[PDB]
Structure 1
Amino acid sequence: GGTPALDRRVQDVNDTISDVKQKWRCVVYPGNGFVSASIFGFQAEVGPNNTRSIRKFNTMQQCIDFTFSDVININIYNPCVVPNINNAECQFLKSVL
C-alpha cells in the first residue's frame, strides 16, 4: 500500500508551480505560427540592441522542444508592460491566460 515511489533526483517544473497561469503554455498564434505564453508574457530572444522579440515556432514540435528543455528563459517579453502599448497583443495574452 501507501503512496507510489518517488524519484526526487529528476526535477519536475509542474511540481513547484501551484498557479496554472504561471506555467508556460505553448499556444497557437494567428499572427505567426505558434509562440510560448504565460501570465508573464511570451518567451523572447536577444535583439540587436538588447531588445525583446518573441520567438516564432513553425510547428507545435519546436515550441514543445524549446519550452520544456533544460535551457532557461532569461528573456521575457510582455506586451502589456514592456511597451505599455496595450494593443491587440495584450488582449490576446489576456484571452490565452
Structure 2
Amino acid sequence: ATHAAFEYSKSIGGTPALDRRVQDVNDTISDVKQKWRCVVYPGNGFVSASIFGFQAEVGPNNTRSIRKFNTMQQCIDFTFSDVININIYNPCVVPNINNAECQFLKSVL
C-alpha cells in the first residue's frame, strides 16, 4: 500500500475529568509588597520599592543610584505621583552593584 493520511490524528486521546477550564485565584498578588513602600536608607535618605524592585535614577555622568528623597513624605508622594512613569531596577541582578546596597534590599524585601 501507499497510504499515510490521518486527517487530524498524531497523538492519543483523553478528556477533562469534571471541568474543562482552570481557575484564576492570585497569580502575583502579595498585597503588602504590591502597595508600594518607602524605607530609610543609612544617612537618612528615604527610598522607594515594590515586589518588582527599587526606584532608580541615572546620573548625567552616566552613573546610577537608588532614587532618594529628603523625607519619607516626599518618597510617599513621589511614589503616588505615578503619572511621571517611574523607572524601577531589579534587585541584585547580573550587573554587579555594591554588596551593602544589596544587603539593605535583602533586609527590606
Q: TM-score range by the shorter chain?
A: 0.5 to 0.7
Instruction: Confirm or deny: 8 A CA contact 1:52 1:75 kept in the other structure.
Output: no
Per-residue CA distance 1:13-39 (angstroms, 9 max, x = gap): 999944533442101111441100233
> What TM-score do you get using the length of structure 1 for normalisation?
0.62
Task: Provide closer, same or farther for how the CA distance between residues 60 and 85 of structure 1 changes in structure 2, counting only shifts above 3 A.
Answer: closer
Instruction: Confirm or deny: 8 A CA contact 1:43 1:73 kept in the other structure.
Output: no
Runs of 4+ in 1 over 6 A off after TM superposition: 1-16
Between structure 1 and structure 2, the one with the greater Rg is 2
Higher relative contact order (CA 8 A, sep 6+): 1
Match of 2:39 in 1: 27
CA distance in 2, matches of 1:72, 1:6: 48
Per-residue CA distance 1:35-81 (angstroms, 9 max, x = gap): 00233332012332655322211101100110011324442234511
Report the 3-state secondary structure (helix = DSSP H, G, I; strand = E; otherwise coil) of the residue aligned with 2:86.
coil
- Cα-Cα RMSD: 8.7
CA distance in 2, matches of 1:93, 1:21: 13
Superposition pairs for residues 55-94 of structure 1, below 5 Å?
Answer: 55-81=67-93, 83-85=95-97, 87-94=99-106
Instruction: Confirm or deny: 8 A CA contact 1:34 1:59 kept in the other structure.
Output: yes
> Larger strand proportion, structure 1 or 2?
2
Report the 3-state secondary structure (helix = DSSP H, G, I; strand = E; otherwise coil) of the residue aligned with 1:64.
helix
Identical-residue share of aligned pairs (%): 100
> What TM-score do you get using the length of structure 2 for normalisation?
0.57
Instruction: Confirm or deny: 8 A CA contact 1:14 1:23 kept in the other structure.
Output: no
